[PDB]
Structure 1
Amino acid sequence: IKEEHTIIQAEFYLLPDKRGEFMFDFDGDEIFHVDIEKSETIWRLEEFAKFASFEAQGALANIAVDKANLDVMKERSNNTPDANVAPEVTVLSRSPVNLGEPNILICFIDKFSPPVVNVTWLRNGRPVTEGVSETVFLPRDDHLFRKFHYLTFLPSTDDFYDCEVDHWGLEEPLRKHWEFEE
């Protein structure tokens, strides 16, 4: 037998937003990330917590280095920025959709940078703020990021959904539509 895997420690610090991030990825999925402001390790799946631990302070220390380093890089490049790269957005259900059976809609935001985005779930044109969740900015093989936003929903033919995504690289917000269709 053979066990082929990849573990990645991904971290960044962004200006002028002053936002940092520290996470671990296993074969493309997030193991955990550290809530930089609260200094706490957030596991992607609750069950993971009983098998390991991670001292959040190590991530904070690394991000502190990244922040110092960013100033050095800005100085070295004479503050020459790059263009904003807009994301691709896709909406799909997590499981086969059956009327009246709870399901989850996934809004997959991909291939973009900088790692900052505004996302709004809409059900029948109205923002939904309950039963929603999101991942942090996840690494890709290249220099770009991806992210997942989720919405719990109850399949019905009277509804239609939209995932609206805004990014500094888009002319106008992008609104992706989704509706049940057996």
Structure 2
Amino acid sequence: IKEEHVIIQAEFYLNPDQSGEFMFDFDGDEIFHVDMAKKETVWRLEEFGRFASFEAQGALANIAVDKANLEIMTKRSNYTPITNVPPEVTVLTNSPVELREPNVLICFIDKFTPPVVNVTWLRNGKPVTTGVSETVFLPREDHLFRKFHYLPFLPSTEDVYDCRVEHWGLDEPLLKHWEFD
């Protein structure tokens, strides 16, 4: 048997952070996730919301269970902690760059755990927050996580960019550079 698609409902709960996540995945792409604070379903692509619905408060029922079970597993594992596993960071654009033509820079953060990471887009050293989009931690067969961040930009020979990622598995922040060559 060769497979065709896989839909994965993935959810996690992490102590001490007390972070949780509920999300659906179709072939590597997230369909939606439930904003735990706004108790609201957020679809990766709005269009999706025209074809389907999800009761966002149920996701919270689940995270409550997951936390309960974390408490129980943590105790039965005699408090065996998770081994940080640092992320592979790669920065690439959306399409070939043409000067003074809009594009998007993607910072792909991969193969890491626990699911807590800080990311910053730096343009010429300064943090950029305009237009910055990002995804939630996507699941991996290896039980580690995956994540992306985007920064819509206008190509010029004048600016240089970096994606600065912070993870507890790295001994110092990681800058993956990008500049027109």
Q: Distance in 2 between matches of 1:139 and 1:109?
A: 12
Indicate yes or no: 2:28 matched with 1:34: no
Q: Is the 8 A contact 2:167 2:173 kept in 1?
A: yes
Please list every run of 5 or more consecutive structure 1 residues that lacks an aligned counterpart in the other structure. none
* 2:69 alignment partner, SS class: helix
Instruction: Please give the alpha-carbon distance, in whole angstroms, between the structure 1 residues aligned to 2:6 and 2:80.
Output: 33
Map of 2:103 onto structure 1? 103
The CA distance in 1 between the partners of 2:113 and 2:82, in whole Å, is 10
CA distance in 1, matches of 2:159, 2:90: 18
Deviation string for 1:105-125 (max 9, x for gaps)? 000000000000000100011
Q: What's 1:158 paired with? A: 158
User: Which 4+ residue blocks in structure 1 deviate beyond 6 angstroms?
Assistant: none
1:141 match: secondary structure? coil
TM-score by length of 2: 0.97
For the aligned residue pairs, the C-alpha RMSD in angstroms reads 1.2
User: Which residue pairs with 1:8 in the alignment?
Assistant: 8
Equivalents in 1 of 2:33, 2:106: separation in Å? 20
Aligned residue type for 2:83: A
Identity %: 81
The one-letter amino acid of 1:79's match is Y
Separation in 2, partners of 1:75, 1:141:
25
| 1:92 counterpart = 2:95 | no
2:139 matched residue in structure 1? 139
Quote the offset at 1:82 in angstroms: 2.9
Shift of residue 3 of structure 1? 8.3
Matched-pair contact (CA < 8 Å) for 2:82–2:114: no
Number of aligned pairs?
Answer: 180
